[PDB]
Design an enzyme around this catalytic site. Structure first.
Site, PDB file in Angstrom:
ATOM      1  N   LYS A   1      47.692  36.712  43.935  1.00 46.38           N
ATOM      2  CA  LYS A   1      48.657  36.734  45.286  1.00 46.38           C
ATOM      3  C   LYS A   1      49.271  35.484  45.248  1.00 46.38           C
ATOM      4  O   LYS A   1      50.000  34.836  44.357  1.00 46.38           O
ATOM      5  CB  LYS A   1      47.776  37.018  46.456  1.00 46.38           C
ATOM      6  CG  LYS A   1      46.851  38.330  46.072  1.00 46.38           C
ATOM      7  CD  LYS A   1      45.541  37.779  46.000  1.00 46.38           C
ATOM      8  CE  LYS A   1      45.070  37.009  47.101  1.00 46.38           C
ATOM      9  NZ  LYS A   1      43.920  36.209  47.093  1.00 46.38           N
TER      10      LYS A   1
ATOM     11  N   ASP B   1      42.181  33.860  44.075  1.00 49.24           N
ATOM     12  CA  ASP B   1      42.908  32.858  42.966  1.00 49.24           C
ATOM     13  C   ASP B   1      43.815  34.012  42.374  1.00 49.24           C
ATOM     14  O   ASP B   1      44.909  33.710  41.779  1.00 49.24           O
ATOM     15  CB  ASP B   1      41.829  32.410  42.187  1.00 49.24           C
ATOM     16  CG  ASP B   1      42.387  31.112  41.384  1.00 49.24           C
ATOM     17  OD1 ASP B   1      42.537  30.225  42.076  1.00 49.24           O
ATOM     18  OD2 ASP B   1      42.641  31.421  40.303  1.00 49.24           O
TER      19      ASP B   1
END
Ligand SMILES: C/C=C\C=C\[C@@H]1O[C@](O)([C@H](CC)C(=O)NC/C=C/C=C(\C)[C@@H](OC)[C@@H](C)[C@@H]2O[C@H](/C=C/C=C/C=C(\C)C(=O)c3c(O)cc[nH]c3=O)[C@H](O)[C@@H]2O)[C@H](O)[C@H](O)C1(C)C
Ligand SMILES: Nc1nc2c(ncn2[C@@H]2O[C@H](COP(=O)(O)OP(=O)(O)O)[C@@H](O)[C@H]2O)c(=O)[nH]1
Lengths: 208, 99, 385, 83
Positions: free
Chosen positions: C24, C21
């Site tokens: 990225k 989360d």
RNA sequence: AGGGGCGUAGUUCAAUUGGUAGAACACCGGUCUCCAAAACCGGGUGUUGGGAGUUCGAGUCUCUCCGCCCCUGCCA
RNA sequence: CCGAGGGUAGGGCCCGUGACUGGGGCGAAGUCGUAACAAGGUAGCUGUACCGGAAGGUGCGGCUGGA
RNA sequence: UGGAGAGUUUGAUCCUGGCUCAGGGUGAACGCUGGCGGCGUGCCUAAGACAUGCAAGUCGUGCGGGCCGCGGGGUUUUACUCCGUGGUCAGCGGCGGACGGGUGAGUAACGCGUGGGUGACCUACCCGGAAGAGGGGGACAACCCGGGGAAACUCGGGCUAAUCCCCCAUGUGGACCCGCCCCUUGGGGUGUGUCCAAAGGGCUUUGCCCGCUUCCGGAUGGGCCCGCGUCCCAUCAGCUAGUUGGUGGGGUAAUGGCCCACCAAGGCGACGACGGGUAGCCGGUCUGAGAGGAUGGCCGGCCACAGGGGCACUGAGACACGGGCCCCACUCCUACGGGAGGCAGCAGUUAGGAAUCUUCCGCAAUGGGCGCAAGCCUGACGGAGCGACGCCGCUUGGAGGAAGAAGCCCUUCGGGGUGUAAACUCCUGAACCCGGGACGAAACCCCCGACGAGGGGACUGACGGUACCGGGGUAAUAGCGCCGGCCAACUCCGUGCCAGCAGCCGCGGUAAUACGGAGGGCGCGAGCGUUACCCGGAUUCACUGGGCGUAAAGGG
């Protein structure tokens, strides 16, 4: 491919002495001259009256093994030998003698049959001018088989070509020993070929 | 995405209209001809049937009727008309027919 | 309607990491939009790409998260440098830890960092704390955490400000900029390895597809030599026996390649092969190179508990899994007499019998895992069968 | 129309055409109106081009367009020479 | 590739308060016989699917792994 | 006008399937008897009819492939 | 110019009879094994669905333009760009896209085979003959401008060219109605009336070449019709309203209920009608002593079909594989009102399946379309690729070499076997290396002769730097089945009605030539076995060539 392996192992088994090796198979030890019996572990015990089949098998193998011709060709050439007008007995035997390498062997050149083949598979042999290398090449009338030139000086071709001085060729072949030629005057005859084979049986074996 | 065979189609529609008309003509012009042939107009009948026999061979020139097709249309015309005018008529002014 | 690919800049592929989360996937999006301005013209790992006016980059964005490890590994096993992403909200997260010890378990040289979600709750010590936390962690896994490029710059911001317009150069965005900071922190500091091209050929297989109207395509990370259209090859490993085929397709990120070299993630369309015949794990190599085997002695070093591994060691008969190139095949363990006592951090040699043929060649390292934890690594010595 | 073409027979790398009269529309190797000759383009034999004058001429006299190369061989066979 | 199942004698099944795992019928073993069936004595004959984990002790409770079934994944 | 197809309705042929049910073939060592083969212990076989756990029995006529 | 039989019912025998084996065959698949080459050959199932690229075009020597590069200013400069002229986009107009290529779904039928008929017909282009080609008029594209539109493209106004269209003449001749004559189904001659032709293009120019029109004939290719032949079920027995025939029509190149009014009641069926099932037919192919049986893949001929289905237009010809109109199902685009496609063309994908190939190179040859020609197009075709799928050729060496190494196996512990096999000695030289290197290709065309005959000249090779040849040159793969009898081939150990074998008969229950391993042997060899299917054997549906008292079979 053309067997390749223990042959004076068949001089035995077929129990009818064979010289597929030539020199030795011609000596006081054709392998046959020490064991007139088949190979294997048994090879020297009572033998059941070979079946009507067995005989024919042995007769055939006797012949086919006597050239090195692998079945496929053997049996194939046989069929050709059938349609051809005439006795399959002569014919076939004749078509087995027309085998290039064979004649090679039939006209000195090579001590034995298996050796005559290689001479063909290396060029050493030549016909009516141009050379040939198919052991299956079928010789025809009036055609001479000559050695090549590159060979003529080879240690082997010597000794082998020497054994001719004195000895005469078959009644359907000539021979310019010094000029290594000799023609194929005509298809050999049943009598001329003194073979330990009873063609008439070898024939019956292909009926069934 | 296409291929030029369309040249053959447009073209198709064109002359598909050319002899569509040449043809509907022969028809509407054949009827009237006989549509009088029973009345007895004799003279006028052979007049139209004469224009009729023209327009038929006419279409025969190109790819519309061609040969025998035209020859049949004619024979029936120069038949019906005649076969009619004999019901009290006598061929007035020598129309296409020949008695 | 296809369009060739032409070489100019070198080529180094990389991917993102860090706890799920955080930043990225969405960031990865950005890096693409950015080097898309002044070039060129105009659950499952996602290869994409983008190029700085200085180098060509192939980008692999493993979805991350737990459960997705086996798949994760094959990613950082092919990248030259990882972009450790961290959010300026939560900090050093657990998976950020796991997507790290792994990197050191796969070698992965140098790791660029990047503080994401920056545009959220400013704090003196914080931004200067977070960057301290990280480095304090990278050295906690023996990395150059002290000399690591820590760019800051919440990327979504970069994205949505490039979505309004697909064109924007440097400096013009206090939010883009913060991107190029990474696109220069990477350009620099992140070396450019040397892939042996003089060597034969090999290419582990990552995924296998079937391009419609063509056939099966195998994507992998070139190991040695190279491969161009029309070269025969052996698909060594897994399945009945090493089948043979003629490569008839090589493409780089959906752009026709002329001779993809080592370190190039290309897709190879093989001649006459079905999707059931090509699995992951197996290899594409030079015909005659490498052979499928199941029995081998390997020089292995079993990690220590403190080093992650086992803490009770084991005896002969233990069946762990083994990692080669790109897959996980199981294996039975047999010890050379008296070696029965194999405890942690020990260094010895025994023999393994894989329940699936695999391309082994002596001189090839691997990795033993089990019960969720790299238990040890080694290398292939002599081959028994 | 009715041409006088060459139909290919014989094995691979061993062609042997058969000079023949066929409706220009038929497959080249399909059924034909009448053979009037053969032609081995590699010679490999003294006789590599025979033709049947009496028939070749007859067909030409009823409208049988020969082939560019078919004509060459009738020619070489001596069909158009008139003396 | 990712989830969720399902795997105990030779088969069908019981023990899930964490405690060498029995129940039935089979089969095995002797004895009689050529050898069986029958009869009579005598026997759990199991890789609890593998391998590890926690624990004093695992069929049970963790993880990983093999096969199979189901669901969702999967255009260089 | 005709007309592909669509729509309502009703027939024909064939195939799959159905609780339950009829007999059939096959299947090392189950149960009951004992019909047949030696007047097989009531000569057998037979068409039909009634009867009976079962083989089968009895009636009527027929056969000898019985004395 | 051509015929072989064995096992198996019984304590034993003869007979009857079924089953089974030995022989060939194949678009094969599956197992183990696999070196080279040539020639063949390779979706038999889903006629299931298909990305992408290519499978049909060509002529400016038919016509007017657009645009670009250049004679080079038309006047004297960029005014009337007239035109010189090789090109390139499309339009017009012509010929070809109806052949070639694919498939076997449908079809039991004049569909095919075979022999005929047509006084009942057609045939573009190509040959031989005859006669022509005189006047005239006109349109629509292309282009200019305007308009709606996402697009595919469309509507409107107006120029213009023709070998596009139409009017008149001409009438060698042809078509039609009526009459006559010959002949006999509608054919041939004839008379009066009527009706019908046509285009110019390039040159080297009162002449040629290519065209055009009419009629006659030649060729080739067709339509239609007829006799005979063409599978299983009779547990399928009766079927028929455009049904069977007539008359007059429409229709067509033409016969005909092909279609239509009206009329008459017919037609067909055990010599198998109607119906149900299966199937494209043939030349041939396999098998057989033969008569037969089985089959119809490759190649050749005919038919039929083109996602399912209906229809017509153009045209010599199609109711048209890469043309059209429409319905349907499916899949896709869409600016949601309308658009798009049809690999049973070649490659290729996926599905189904026991299983069936490269998104290859070349138009060099042959063949085709269009062109005066140069030449253009051509996944027809010529090759190449992949697969022991098949046939054929070839290799893994040859000659020496021990009363006989070792190892393995037997043993009456003397020995016997694997075995001249090895090792070992010489000898040849598959591969590979270097050099050289094709045939298939001679005319189109050009020059002399007239663009005729004949002679000479030039260009052109995908396969290939391949075959082949010269020189150099290394001992350089072997496997599969079987060994009780049929049937070639036997011992030891293991097991103990277990594990397993098995085509038939049958092997195994503690001494198994039958299971499994080993040694040894037999067979065949880049192969060798296995499964499926066809014929044979099976005189076992018997025509050749069998039977019925008791074996099946005499009808009460
Ligand atoms: C690991 C999975 C797959 C590997 C595949 C293959 O690995 C490789 O074979 C590779 C070759 C060397 C290999 O064998 N990898 C296999 C192994 C390689 C191991 C190498 C290097 C080491 O050195 C001893 C290295 C990590 C070493 O450890 C230290 C870390 C200790 C950490 C302890 C844990 C701590 C605090 C912790 O909180 C922690 C945790 O992390 C996890 C769970 N719970 C915890 O509580 C330090 O960071 C050092 O750097 C090749 O790279 C192949 O090409 C490959 C990529 C295909
Ligand atoms: N404002 C802001 N939101 C972000 C930023 N990075 C990620 N997010 C949001 O926070 C969540 C990031 O999850 P994701 O992009 O999937 O990262 P991953 O889950 O680590 O791959 C999503 O809602 C992103 O839109 C950022 O730099 N700024």
């Amino acid at each position: 491919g053309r067997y390749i392996g223990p042959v004076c192992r068949l001089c035995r088994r077929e129990g009818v002495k064979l010289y597929l090796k030539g020199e030795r198979c011609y000596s006081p030890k054709c392998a046959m001259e020490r064991r007139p019996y088949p190979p294997g572990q048994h090879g020297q015990k009572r033998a059941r009256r070979p079946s009507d089949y067995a005989v024919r098998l042995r007769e055939k193998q006797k012949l086919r093994r006597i050239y090195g011709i692998s079945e496929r060709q053997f049996r194939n050439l046989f069929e050709e030998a059938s349609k051809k007008k005439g006795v399959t007995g002569s014919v076939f035997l004749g078509l087995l003698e027309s085998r290039l390498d064979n004649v090679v062997y039939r006209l000195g050149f090579a001590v034995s049959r298996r050796q005559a083949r290689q001479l063909v598979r290396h060029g050493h042999i030549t016909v009516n001018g141009r050379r040939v290398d198919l052991p299956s090449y079928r010789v025809r009338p009036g055609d001479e088989i000559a050695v090549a030139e590159k060979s003529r000086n080879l240690e082997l071709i010597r000794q082998n070509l020497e054994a001719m001085k004195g000895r005469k060729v078959g009644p359907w072949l000539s021979l310019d020993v010094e000029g290594m030629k000799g023609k194929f005057l005509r298809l050999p005859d049943r009598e001329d070929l003194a073979l330990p084979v009873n063609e008439q049986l070898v024939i019956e074996f292909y009926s069934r | 995405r296409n291929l030029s065979a369309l040249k053959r189609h447009r073209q198709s529609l064109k002359r598909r209209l050319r002899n569509k008309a040449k043809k509907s003509a022969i028809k509407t012009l054949s009827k009237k001809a006989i549509q009088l042939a029973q009345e007895g107009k004799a003279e006028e009948a052979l007049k139209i049937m004469r224009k009729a026999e023209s327009l038929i061979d006419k279409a025969a020139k190109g790819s519309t009727l061609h040969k025998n097709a035209a020859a049949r249309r004619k024979s029936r015309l120069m038949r019906k008309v005649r076969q009619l005018l004999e019901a009290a008529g006598a061929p007035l002014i020598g129309g296409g027919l020949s008695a | 309607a296809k369009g060739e690919f032409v070489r100019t800049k070198p080529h180094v592929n990389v991917g993102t990491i860090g706890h799920v989360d955080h930043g990225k996937t969405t960031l990865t999006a950005a890096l693409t939009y950015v080097a898309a301005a002044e070039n060129p013209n105009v659950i499952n790992t996602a290869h994409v790409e983008y190029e700085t006016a200085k180098r060509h980059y192939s980008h692999v964005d493993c979805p991350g998260h737990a459960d997705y490890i086996k798949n994760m590994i094959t990613g950082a096993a092919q990248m030259d440098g990882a972009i450790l992403v961290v959010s300026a909200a939560d900090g050093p997260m657990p998976q950020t830890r796991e997507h790290i010890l792994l990197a050191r378990q796969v070698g992965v040289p140098y790791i660029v960092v990047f503080m994401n979600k920056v545009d959220m709750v400013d704090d003196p010590e914080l931004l200067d704390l977070v960057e301290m936390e990280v480095r304090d962690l990278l050295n906690q896994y023996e990395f150059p955490g002290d000399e690591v490029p820590v760019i800051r710059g919440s990327a979504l911001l970069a994205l949505e400000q490039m979505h309004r317009n697909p064109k924007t150069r440097r400096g013009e965005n206090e939010w883009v900029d913060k991107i190029w900071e990474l696109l220069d922190a990477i350009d620099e500091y992140i070396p450019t390895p040397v892939r042996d091209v003089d060597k034969p050929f090999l290419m582990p297989v990552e995924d296998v597809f079937t391009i419609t109207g063509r056939g099966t395509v195998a994507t992998g990370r070139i190991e040695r030599g190279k491969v161009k259209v029309g070269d025969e090859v052996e698909i060594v490993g897994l399945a009945p026996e090493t089948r043979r085929t003629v490569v008839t397709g090589v493409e780089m990120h959906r752009k026709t390649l002329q001779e993809g070299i080592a370190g190039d993630n290309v897709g190879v369309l093989l001649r006459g092969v079905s999707r059931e015949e090509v699995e992951r794990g197996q290899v594409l190599a030079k015909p005659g190179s490498i052979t499928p085997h199941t029995k081998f002695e390997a020089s292995v070093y079993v990690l220590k508990k403190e080093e992650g591994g086992r803490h009770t060691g084991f005896f002969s008969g233990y069946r762990p899994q083994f990692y080669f190139r790109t897959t996980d095949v199981t294996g039975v363990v047999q010890l050379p007499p008296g070696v029965e006592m194999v405890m942690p951090g020990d260094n010895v040699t025994f023999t393994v019998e894989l329940i699936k043929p695999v391309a082994l060649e002596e001189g090839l390292r691997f990795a033993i895992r089990e019960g969720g934890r790299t238990v040890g690594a080694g290398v292939v010595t002599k081959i028994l069968e | 129309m009715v041409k006088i073409r060459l139909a290919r027979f014989g094995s691979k790398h061993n062609p042997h055409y058969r000079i023949v009269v066929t409706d220009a529309r038929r497959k080249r190797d399909g059924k034909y109106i009448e053979k009037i000759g053969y032609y081995d383009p590699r010679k490999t034999t003294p006789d590599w081009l025979k033709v049947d004058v009496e028939r070749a001429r007859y067909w030409l006299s009823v409208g049988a367009q020969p082939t560019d190369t078919a004509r060459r061989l009738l020619r070489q066979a001596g069909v158009f020479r008139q003396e």
